[PDB]
């Protein structure tokens, strides 16, 4: 994979020019795109900017995020040829930092369950995950140094795990969702894909200018709390194997690891995530559902058809439960710096299964809002397995530092 | 003004037909538009729908809100002729309820401070307020029984006061802002304009299907707390005249009224509102500011130019302050049912002043998120003066019941 931090350093010293760096990306995309199919649109004429911390840095953009120079088709026929008038704020954050928007990456229809044609870089017979399919696959295939995605259930962390890339779903609302096709406004959260935790940090620093992302270094002997999210049921062997590998590597690295239970209130929050998500989805996708019902991808159309009856009442009760879960989860971080858990049910599903994977191990965290970072751990049968590092809400920097720590610990 | 509730009753009982009701709005618009200029575009071909509680109800939509059948120009040349692909979720709530989208009402450029050509229905030489100028003026001119707007600072309450219409800025995030051009995502809140509080209730009921908006009745012996927001500076005489009239009528009607000073924490929340609004505005309007700077209307452009230096650090501090304010504000409601304050500095400014009016008496509540309702009280020099009824976050229903009680009280 291409490291953004690496390019940054080489460009800063003059060892690599921005034009060369961008030419590098076009070539990388050109070399693997025909087999991975991660881009809806690759802008071959995209050039490097002359200044800014991200000059020479090519970035792929999930196709539910607006761009003014390229179409934004939401992974749906309904929006074929749709052309937003403006670039979404997050795209502008990148552009303002001097980055190059190299193309739009594939997204499942309206960022839901319907699979894209994208294939896993590690094994084209498997899914790259979703809904940010293209973004994870492109970074995972070594095509680009950075990519933006979004997560409502587990659309950032899961595909990152499947494709073996670093990724972060920042604290809720740190990054604006303006110009990001809404599924659930209570959940939708922008995310980044990169090679390593350090690349994500550098990416966020340039995008936001927040000092918390400046000078980040690997954490030292972190206080880690392992949570297996029993409420979501048992994971597949491969996932547990990766979790054990992570725990052991971290211990040998000097970290104090302890197994911890999550408060009942948090278990309940995980339970009602579907209520908040689907009720809002019906309002957010009202035009689509009313005027283009049969045109909506099969799986999403079906889930929407099954949730029409959700009421404001149960919706409000679900939100109340969500708030209670947030409060008590914070209490959990009073004895530990970060939580360590699964990033996905296991290895990426075979494409034949027509599934982008179950988000059951990602959804809770999207509702709680905490920053989550995927750390690639190992590979089973050639397919990547990762673990999810979670810090307190607003402690994104620490989540990145600990993830970086874990990366170094695994490298031994 | 036209009463939504009245139209509903007459249509339901067969006294009036849906088509006749719509034809009446078309006529009313034609009758005074050349005098008020409240519509960016009027769809003269719009017809009543067949079913729904809102069949026969003509609705005006602020032009920052997406419509699929009509352009959404954001009150800026930058979006001249811009045609959204879909209707915003709030527009769909109305349509699904059977309402008729009769036209797009004027909005200041990007919902900010730059005056539109719209005039106050009560006096053509005065401003209708902003930024939901056309929505307020159209309802005030008796053109339509309902209109949608949005509020960041005071773009719903203030213009409703200036134009003598009832209006409500529901609790933050209750109505989705998807398809509502973002100024500040921490503030932007959709609002409704109507003749009376009851019309707002029926409007919200049809839009959300929430039972709390069903069967609402005027409040009985409400516990009112009067706050004059001294921290927002001195108010104009006319404004106090109206507040005193409201307090007196309320007392005569059996309400318990008491003056109360808001916590220092709340005063501080008022002070930092501009910080949150402007810092986010730079992110939300990044594309326009970077690629079409000189095309941004004068006042908004200067506002943004003066705030390009706001930092994430101070932005965060501002948000912490906001949270404190919300926490201590809730405590204030342990004694009263609603707060009663000014809706505007005073009577509508003359157009010659090139000002939509100062939002200082509205902004705090938008940040707190509480439901706010304007209640027309009286007119000084022929210009309307209203008061603002505020209830606990989430108690929109009670805010309407209390506004209703106040309307009847004033009616004597």
């Amino acid at each position: 994979m291409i490291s953004l931090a690496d390019l940054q350093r080489r460009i800063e010293t003059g060892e690599l020019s921005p034009n060369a760096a961008i030419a590098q990306s076009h070539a990388a995309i050109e070399a693997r795109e025909k087999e991975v199919h991660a881009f809806v649109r690759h802008d071959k004429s995209a050039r490097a900017q002359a200044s800014g911390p991200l000059r020479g840095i090519a970035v792929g953009i999930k196709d539910i995020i607006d761009t003014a120079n390229m179409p934004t088709e939401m992974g749906s026929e309904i929006y074929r040829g749709w052309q937003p008038r403006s670039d979404a704020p997050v795209v502008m954050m990148l552009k303002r930092a001097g980055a190059t928007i190299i193309g739009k990456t594939t997204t499942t229809a309206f960022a839901s369950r319907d699979p894209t044609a994208t294939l896993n870089p590690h094994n084209t017979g498997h899914s790259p995950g979703g809904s940010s399919s293209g973004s994870a696959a492109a970074v995972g295939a070594g095509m680009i140094p950075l990519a933006l995605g979004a997560q409502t259930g587990g659309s950032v962390i899961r595909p990152a795990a499947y494709c073996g890339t670093a990724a972060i779903k920042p604290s809720f609302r740190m990054l604006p969702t303006v110009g990001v096709k809404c599924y659930s406004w209570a959940l939708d959260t922008v995310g980044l894909f990169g090679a390593r935790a350090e690349d994500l940090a550098r990416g966020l620093l340039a995008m936001t200018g927040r000092s918390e992302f400046s000078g980040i270094v690997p954490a030292k002997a972190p206080r880690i709390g392992v949570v297996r999210q029993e409420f979501a049921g048992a994971v597949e062997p491969a996932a547990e194997q990766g979790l054990q590998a992570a725990i052991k590597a971290a211990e040998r690295a000097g970290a104090s690891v302890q197994a911890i239970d999550l408060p009942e209130a948090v278990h309940e929050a995980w339970r009602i995530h579907p209520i908040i998500q689907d009720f809002e989805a019906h309002r957010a996708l009202a035009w689509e559902f009313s005027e283009h019902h049969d045109e909506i991808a099969p799986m999403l159309r079906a889930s929407l058809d099954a949730t029409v009856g959700l009421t404001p009442k149960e919706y409000d009760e679900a939100r109340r439960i969500g708030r209670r879960g947030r409060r008590e989860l914070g209490e959990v971080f009073e004895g530990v710096d970060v939580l360590l858990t699964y990033s996905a049910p296991g290895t990426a599903p075979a494409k034949a299964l027509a599934s982008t994977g179950d988000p059951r191990y990602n959804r809770l965290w999207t509702l709680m809002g905490n920053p989550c970072v995927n750390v690639p751990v190992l590979k089973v049968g050639g397919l990547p397995i990762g673990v999810q590092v979670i810090a307190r809400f607003g402690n994104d920097a620490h989540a990145l530092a600990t993830a970086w720590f874990l990366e170094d610990a695994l490298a031994k």
Side-chain angles (χ1 to χ4, degrees), chain A residues 273-296:
Chain A
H273 174 286
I275 301 292
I276 295 172
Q277 180 191 75
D278 300 329
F279 178 81
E280 299 203 330
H282 263 288
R283 310 323 136 193
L285 296 171
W287 178 77
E288 290 81 353
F289 194 80
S290 294
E291 320 278 7
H292 304 282
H293 180 281
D294 299 330
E295 287 167 80
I296 299 171

PDB file of all heavy atoms in Angstrom, chain A residues 273-296:
ATOM      1  N   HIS A 273     -29.899   0.093  17.337  1.00  0.00           N
ATOM      2  CA  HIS A 273     -29.242   0.784  16.223  1.00  0.00           C
ATOM      3  C   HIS A 273     -30.100   0.664  14.955  1.00  0.00           C
ATOM      4  O   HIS A 273     -30.307   1.646  14.243  1.00  0.00           O
ATOM      5  CB  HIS A 273     -27.846   0.190  15.971  1.00  0.00           C
ATOM      6  CG  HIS A 273     -27.160   0.739  14.757  1.00  0.00           C
ATOM      7  ND1 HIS A 273     -27.518   0.389  13.471  1.00  0.00           N
ATOM      8  CD2 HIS A 273     -26.138   1.622  14.633  1.00  0.00           C
ATOM      9  CE1 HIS A 273     -26.750   1.032  12.612  1.00  0.00           C
ATOM     10  NE2 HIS A 273     -25.905   1.787  13.289  1.00  0.00           N
ATOM     11  N   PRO A 274     -30.612  -0.546  14.661  1.00  0.00           N
ATOM     12  CA  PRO A 274     -31.447  -0.763  13.474  1.00  0.00           C
ATOM     13  C   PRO A 274     -32.721   0.080  13.474  1.00  0.00           C
ATOM     14  O   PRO A 274     -33.221   0.453  12.419  1.00  0.00           O
ATOM     15  CB  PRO A 274     -31.760  -2.254  13.539  1.00  0.00           C
ATOM     16  CG  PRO A 274     -30.544  -2.818  14.197  1.00  0.00           C
ATOM     17  CD  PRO A 274     -30.303  -1.832  15.313  1.00  0.00           C
ATOM     18  N   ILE A 275     -33.252   0.369  14.658  1.00  0.00           N
ATOM     19  CA  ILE A 275     -34.469   1.170  14.746  1.00  0.00           C
ATOM     20  C   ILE A 275     -34.183   2.615  14.330  1.00  0.00           C
ATOM     21  O   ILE A 275     -34.904   3.194  13.519  1.00  0.00           O
ATOM     22  CB  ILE A 275     -35.042   1.179  16.175  1.00  0.00           C
ATOM     23  CG1 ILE A 275     -35.349  -0.249  16.632  1.00  0.00           C
ATOM     24  CG2 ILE A 275     -36.311   2.033  16.216  1.00  0.00           C
ATOM     25  CD1 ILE A 275     -36.482  -0.909  15.879  1.00  0.00           C
ATOM     26  N   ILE A 276     -33.128   3.193  14.896  1.00  0.00           N
ATOM     27  CA  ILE A 276     -32.754   4.563  14.579  1.00  0.00           C
ATOM     28  C   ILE A 276     -32.380   4.676  13.105  1.00  0.00           C
ATOM     29  O   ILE A 276     -32.839   5.577  12.392  1.00  0.00           O
ATOM     30  CB  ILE A 276     -31.561   5.016  15.456  1.00  0.00           C
ATOM     31  CG1 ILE A 276     -31.996   5.050  16.926  1.00  0.00           C
ATOM     32  CG2 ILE A 276     -31.059   6.382  15.005  1.00  0.00           C
ATOM     33  CD1 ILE A 276     -30.867   5.291  17.918  1.00  0.00           C
ATOM     34  N   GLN A 277     -31.557   3.741  12.648  1.00  0.00           N
ATOM     35  CA  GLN A 277     -31.098   3.735  11.272  1.00  0.00           C
ATOM     36  C   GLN A 277     -32.200   3.640  10.223  1.00  0.00           C
ATOM     37  O   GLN A 277     -32.251   4.451   9.295  1.00  0.00           O
ATOM     38  CB  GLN A 277     -30.118   2.586  11.059  1.00  0.00           C
ATOM     39  CG  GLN A 277     -29.582   2.509   9.647  1.00  0.00           C
ATOM     40  CD  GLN A 277     -28.831   1.225   9.390  1.00  0.00           C
ATOM     41  OE1 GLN A 277     -29.430   0.161   9.241  1.00  0.00           O
ATOM     42  NE2 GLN A 277     -27.508   1.313   9.353  1.00  0.00           N
ATOM     43  N   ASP A 278     -33.077   2.650  10.372  1.00  0.00           N
ATOM     44  CA  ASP A 278     -34.142   2.424   9.403  1.00  0.00           C
ATOM     45  C   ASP A 278     -35.273   3.435   9.430  1.00  0.00           C
ATOM     46  O   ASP A 278     -35.845   3.742   8.389  1.00  0.00           O
ATOM     47  CB  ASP A 278     -34.715   1.012   9.560  1.00  0.00           C
ATOM     48  CG  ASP A 278     -33.672  -0.065   9.339  1.00  0.00           C
ATOM     49  OD1 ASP A 278     -32.737   0.171   8.545  1.00  0.00           O
ATOM     50  OD2 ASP A 278     -33.795  -1.153   9.946  1.00  0.00           O
ATOM     51  N   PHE A 279     -35.611   3.943  10.610  1.00  0.00           N
ATOM     52  CA  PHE A 279     -36.678   4.929  10.694  1.00  0.00           C
ATOM     53  C   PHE A 279     -36.215   6.176   9.952  1.00  0.00           C
ATOM     54  O   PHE A 279     -36.938   6.724   9.123  1.00  0.00           O
ATOM     55  CB  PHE A 279     -36.993   5.300  12.147  1.00  0.00           C
ATOM     56  CG  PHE A 279     -38.058   6.364  12.277  1.00  0.00           C
ATOM     57  CD1 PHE A 279     -39.410   6.036  12.187  1.00  0.00           C
ATOM     58  CD2 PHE A 279     -37.707   7.701  12.441  1.00  0.00           C
ATOM     59  CE1 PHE A 279     -40.396   7.025  12.258  1.00  0.00           C
ATOM     60  CE2 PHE A 279     -38.687   8.697  12.511  1.00  0.00           C
ATOM     61  CZ  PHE A 279     -40.029   8.360  12.420  1.00  0.00           C
ATOM     62  N   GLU A 280     -34.999   6.621  10.250  1.00  0.00           N
ATOM     63  CA  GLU A 280     -34.469   7.810   9.598  1.00  0.00           C
ATOM     64  C   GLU A 280     -34.283   7.571   8.114  1.00  0.00           C
ATOM     65  O   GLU A 280     -34.536   8.457   7.305  1.00  0.00           O
ATOM     66  CB  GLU A 280     -33.131   8.231  10.220  1.00  0.00           C
ATOM     67  CG  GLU A 280     -33.215   8.584  11.695  1.00  0.00           C
ATOM     68  CD  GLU A 280     -32.089   9.486  12.143  1.00  0.00           C
ATOM     69  OE1 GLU A 280     -30.985   9.406  11.559  1.00  0.00           O
ATOM     70  OE2 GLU A 280     -32.305  10.268  13.090  1.00  0.00           O
ATOM     71  N   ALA A 281     -33.843   6.368   7.754  1.00  0.00           N
ATOM     72  CA  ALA A 281     -33.626   6.052   6.350  1.00  0.00           C
ATOM     73  C   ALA A 281     -34.882   6.346   5.539  1.00  0.00           C
ATOM     74  O   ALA A 281     -34.798   6.839   4.414  1.00  0.00           O
ATOM     75  CB  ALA A 281     -33.226   4.591   6.189  1.00  0.00           C
ATOM     76  N   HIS A 282     -36.044   6.042   6.108  1.00  0.00           N
ATOM     77  CA  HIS A 282     -37.298   6.283   5.413  1.00  0.00           C
ATOM     78  C   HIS A 282     -37.575   7.762   5.158  1.00  0.00           C
ATOM     79  O   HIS A 282     -38.269   8.110   4.201  1.00  0.00           O
ATOM     80  CB  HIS A 282     -38.459   5.638   6.173  1.00  0.00           C
ATOM     81  CG  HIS A 282     -38.836   4.289   5.647  1.00  0.00           C
ATOM     82  ND1 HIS A 282     -39.490   4.118   4.446  1.00  0.00           N
ATOM     83  CD2 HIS A 282     -38.623   3.047   6.139  1.00  0.00           C
ATOM     84  CE1 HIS A 282     -39.664   2.829   4.222  1.00  0.00           C
ATOM     85  NE2 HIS A 282     -39.146   2.157   5.234  1.00  0.00           N
ATOM     86  N   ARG A 283     -37.044   8.641   6.000  1.00  0.00           N
ATOM     87  CA  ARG A 283     -37.250  10.067   5.767  1.00  0.00           C
ATOM     88  C   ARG A 283     -36.180  10.544   4.797  1.00  0.00           C
ATOM     89  O   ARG A 283     -36.475  11.239   3.828  1.00  0.00           O
ATOM     90  CB  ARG A 283     -37.141  10.888   7.064  1.00  0.00           C
ATOM     91  CG  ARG A 283     -37.964  10.381   8.225  1.00  0.00           C
ATOM     92  CD  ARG A 283     -39.299   9.817   7.783  1.00  0.00           C
ATOM     93  NE  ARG A 283     -39.532   8.566   8.484  1.00  0.00           N
ATOM     94  CZ  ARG A 283     -40.472   7.682   8.177  1.00  0.00           C
ATOM     95  NH1 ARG A 283     -41.305   7.889   7.165  1.00  0.00           N
ATOM     96  NH2 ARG A 283     -40.557   6.574   8.886  1.00  0.00           N
ATOM     97  N   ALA A 284     -34.938  10.147   5.060  1.00  0.00           N
ATOM     98  CA  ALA A 284     -33.799  10.549   4.236  1.00  0.00           C
ATOM     99  C   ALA A 284     -33.885  10.070   2.790  1.00  0.00           C
ATOM    100  O   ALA A 284     -33.355  10.712   1.882  1.00  0.00           O
ATOM    101  CB  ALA A 284     -32.497  10.062   4.870  1.00  0.00           C
ATOM    102  N   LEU A 285     -34.545   8.938   2.573  1.00  0.00           N
ATOM    103  CA  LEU A 285     -34.690   8.393   1.224  1.00  0.00           C
ATOM    104  C   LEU A 285     -36.146   8.440   0.775  1.00  0.00           C
ATOM    105  O   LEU A 285     -36.577   7.625  -0.040  1.00  0.00           O
ATOM    106  CB  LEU A 285     -34.193   6.945   1.192  1.00  0.00           C
ATOM    107  CG  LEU A 285     -32.707   6.744   1.490  1.00  0.00           C
ATOM    108  CD1 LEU A 285     -32.394   5.267   1.653  1.00  0.00           C
ATOM    109  CD2 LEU A 285     -31.892   7.354   0.361  1.00  0.00           C
ATOM    110  N   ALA A 286     -36.903   9.400   1.302  1.00  0.00           N
ATOM    111  CA  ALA A 286     -38.322   9.521   0.972  1.00  0.00           C
ATOM    112  C   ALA A 286     -38.599   9.723  -0.511  1.00  0.00           C
ATOM    113  O   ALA A 286     -39.501   9.099  -1.076  1.00  0.00           O
ATOM    114  CB  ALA A 286     -38.946  10.648   1.767  1.00  0.00           C
ATOM    115  N   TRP A 287     -37.838  10.600  -1.146  1.00  0.00           N
ATOM    116  CA  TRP A 287     -38.045  10.850  -2.565  1.00  0.00           C
ATOM    117  C   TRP A 287     -37.803   9.571  -3.367  1.00  0.00           C
ATOM    118  O   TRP A 287     -38.603   9.202  -4.229  1.00  0.00           O
ATOM    119  CB  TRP A 287     -37.110  11.955  -3.053  1.00  0.00           C
ATOM    120  CG  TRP A 287     -37.248  12.238  -4.520  1.00  0.00           C
ATOM    121  CD1 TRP A 287     -38.248  12.940  -5.134  1.00  0.00           C
ATOM    122  CD2 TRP A 287     -36.364  11.805  -5.557  1.00  0.00           C
ATOM    123  NE1 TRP A 287     -38.039  12.970  -6.492  1.00  0.00           N
ATOM    124  CE2 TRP A 287     -36.888  12.281  -6.780  1.00  0.00           C
ATOM    125  CE3 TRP A 287     -35.177  11.058  -5.573  1.00  0.00           C
ATOM    126  CZ2 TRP A 287     -36.266  12.035  -8.010  1.00  0.00           C
ATOM    127  CZ3 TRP A 287     -34.559  10.812  -6.797  1.00  0.00           C
ATOM    128  CH2 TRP A 287     -35.106  11.300  -7.996  1.00  0.00           C
ATOM    129  N   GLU A 288     -36.697   8.896  -3.076  1.00  0.00           N
ATOM    130  CA  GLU A 288     -36.358   7.659  -3.769  1.00  0.00           C
ATOM    131  C   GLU A 288     -37.421   6.573  -3.596  1.00  0.00           C
ATOM    132  O   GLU A 288     -37.821   5.921  -4.562  1.00  0.00           O
ATOM    133  CB  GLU A 288     -35.013   7.122  -3.267  1.00  0.00           C
ATOM    134  CG  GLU A 288     -33.803   7.953  -3.677  1.00  0.00           C
ATOM    135  CD  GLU A 288     -33.576   9.171  -2.795  1.00  0.00           C
ATOM    136  OE1 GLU A 288     -34.429   9.474  -1.932  1.00  0.00           O
ATOM    137  OE2 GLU A 288     -32.534   9.832  -2.976  1.00  0.00           O
ATOM    138  N   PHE A 289     -37.871   6.388  -2.359  1.00  0.00           N
ATOM    139  CA  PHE A 289     -38.859   5.370  -2.029  1.00  0.00           C
ATOM    140  C   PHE A 289     -40.240   5.648  -2.618  1.00  0.00           C
ATOM    141  O   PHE A 289     -40.947   4.719  -3.002  1.00  0.00           O
ATOM    142  CB  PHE A 289     -38.972   5.230  -0.506  1.00  0.00           C
ATOM    143  CG  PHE A 289     -39.714   3.999  -0.060  1.00  0.00           C
ATOM    144  CD1 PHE A 289     -39.079   2.758  -0.035  1.00  0.00           C
ATOM    145  CD2 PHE A 289     -41.048   4.078   0.328  1.00  0.00           C
ATOM    146  CE1 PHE A 289     -39.766   1.612   0.375  1.00  0.00           C
ATOM    147  CE2 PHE A 289     -41.740   2.943   0.737  1.00  0.00           C
ATOM    148  CZ  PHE A 289     -41.094   1.702   0.761  1.00  0.00           C
ATOM    149  N   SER A 290     -40.620   6.920  -2.686  1.00  0.00           N
ATOM    150  CA  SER A 290     -41.920   7.312  -3.224  1.00  0.00           C
ATOM    151  C   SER A 290     -41.997   7.402  -4.746  1.00  0.00           C
ATOM    152  O   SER A 290     -42.983   6.976  -5.339  1.00  0.00           O
ATOM    153  CB  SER A 290     -42.348   8.669  -2.655  1.00  0.00           C
ATOM    154  OG  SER A 290     -42.583   8.607  -1.262  1.00  0.00           O
ATOM    155  N   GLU A 291     -40.966   7.962  -5.376  1.00  0.00           N
ATOM    156  CA  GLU A 291     -40.976   8.148  -6.826  1.00  0.00           C
ATOM    157  C   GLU A 291     -40.193   7.124  -7.643  1.00  0.00           C
ATOM    158  O   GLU A 291     -40.421   6.991  -8.846  1.00  0.00           O
ATOM    159  CB  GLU A 291     -40.435   9.537  -7.177  1.00  0.00           C
ATOM    160  CG  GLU A 291     -40.891  10.662  -6.260  1.00  0.00           C
ATOM    161  CD  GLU A 291     -42.261  11.187  -6.602  1.00  0.00           C
ATOM    162  OE1 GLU A 291     -42.931  10.590  -7.472  1.00  0.00           O
ATOM    163  OE2 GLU A 291     -42.668  12.204  -5.996  1.00  0.00           O
ATOM    164  N   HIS A 292     -39.268   6.413  -7.006  1.00  0.00           N
ATOM    165  CA  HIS A 292     -38.451   5.440  -7.726  1.00  0.00           C
ATOM    166  C   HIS A 292     -38.256   4.150  -6.948  1.00  0.00           C
ATOM    167  O   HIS A 292     -37.175   3.563  -6.962  1.00  0.00           O
ATOM    168  CB  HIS A 292     -37.098   6.076  -8.050  1.00  0.00           C
ATOM    169  CG  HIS A 292     -37.217   7.354  -8.818  1.00  0.00           C
ATOM    170  ND1 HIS A 292     -37.486   7.384 -10.169  1.00  0.00           N
ATOM    171  CD2 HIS A 292     -37.194   8.645  -8.410  1.00  0.00           C
ATOM    172  CE1 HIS A 292     -37.624   8.638 -10.560  1.00  0.00           C
ATOM    173  NE2 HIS A 292     -37.452   9.422  -9.512  1.00  0.00           N
ATOM    174  N   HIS A 293     -39.326   3.704  -6.296  1.00  0.00           N
ATOM    175  CA  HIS A 293     -39.301   2.498  -5.481  1.00  0.00           C
ATOM    176  C   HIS A 293     -38.688   1.277  -6.166  1.00  0.00           C
ATOM    177  O   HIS A 293     -37.710   0.709  -5.672  1.00  0.00           O
ATOM    178  CB  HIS A 293     -40.725   2.179  -4.998  1.00  0.00           C
ATOM    179  CG  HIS A 293     -40.814   0.953  -4.144  1.00  0.00           C
ATOM    180  ND1 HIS A 293     -40.814  -0.322  -4.669  1.00  0.00           N
ATOM    181  CD2 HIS A 293     -40.875   0.807  -2.799  1.00  0.00           C
ATOM    182  CE1 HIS A 293     -40.868  -1.200  -3.683  1.00  0.00           C
ATOM    183  NE2 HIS A 293     -40.906  -0.541  -2.538  1.00  0.00           N
ATOM    184  N   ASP A 294     -39.251   0.882  -7.303  1.00  0.00           N
ATOM    185  CA  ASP A 294     -38.762  -0.290  -8.022  1.00  0.00           C
ATOM    186  C   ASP A 294     -37.359  -0.153  -8.597  1.00  0.00           C
ATOM    187  O   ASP A 294     -36.741  -1.151  -8.976  1.00  0.00           O
ATOM    188  CB  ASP A 294     -39.734  -0.673  -9.142  1.00  0.00           C
ATOM    189  CG  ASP A 294     -41.113  -1.021  -8.618  1.00  0.00           C
ATOM    190  OD1 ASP A 294     -41.208  -1.510  -7.468  1.00  0.00           O
ATOM    191  OD2 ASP A 294     -42.098  -0.816  -9.359  1.00  0.00           O
ATOM    192  N   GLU A 295     -36.859   1.078  -8.660  1.00  0.00           N
ATOM    193  CA  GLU A 295     -35.522   1.335  -9.180  1.00  0.00           C
ATOM    194  C   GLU A 295     -34.444   1.180  -8.109  1.00  0.00           C
ATOM    195  O   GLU A 295     -33.258   1.144  -8.419  1.00  0.00           O
ATOM    196  CB  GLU A 295     -35.449   2.742  -9.764  1.00  0.00           C
ATOM    197  CG  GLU A 295     -36.175   2.906 -11.080  1.00  0.00           C
ATOM    198  CD  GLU A 295     -36.335   4.365 -11.461  1.00  0.00           C
ATOM    199  OE1 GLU A 295     -35.363   4.963 -11.972  1.00  0.00           O
ATOM    200  OE2 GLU A 295     -37.429   4.917 -11.232  1.00  0.00           O
ATOM    201  N   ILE A 296     -34.851   1.108  -6.846  1.00  0.00           N
ATOM    202  CA  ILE A 296     -33.894   0.952  -5.754  1.00  0.00           C
ATOM    203  C   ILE A 296     -33.354  -0.474  -5.749  1.00  0.00           C
ATOM    204  O   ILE A 296     -34.113  -1.425  -5.923  1.00  0.00           O
ATOM    205  CB  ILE A 296     -34.558   1.231  -4.393  1.00  0.00           C
ATOM    206  CG1 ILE A 296     -35.076   2.672  -4.352  1.00  0.00           C
ATOM    207  CG2 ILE A 296     -33.562   0.998  -3.267  1.00  0.00           C
ATOM    208  CD1 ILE A 296     -35.935   2.974  -3.140  1.00  0.00           C
TER     209      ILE A 296
END
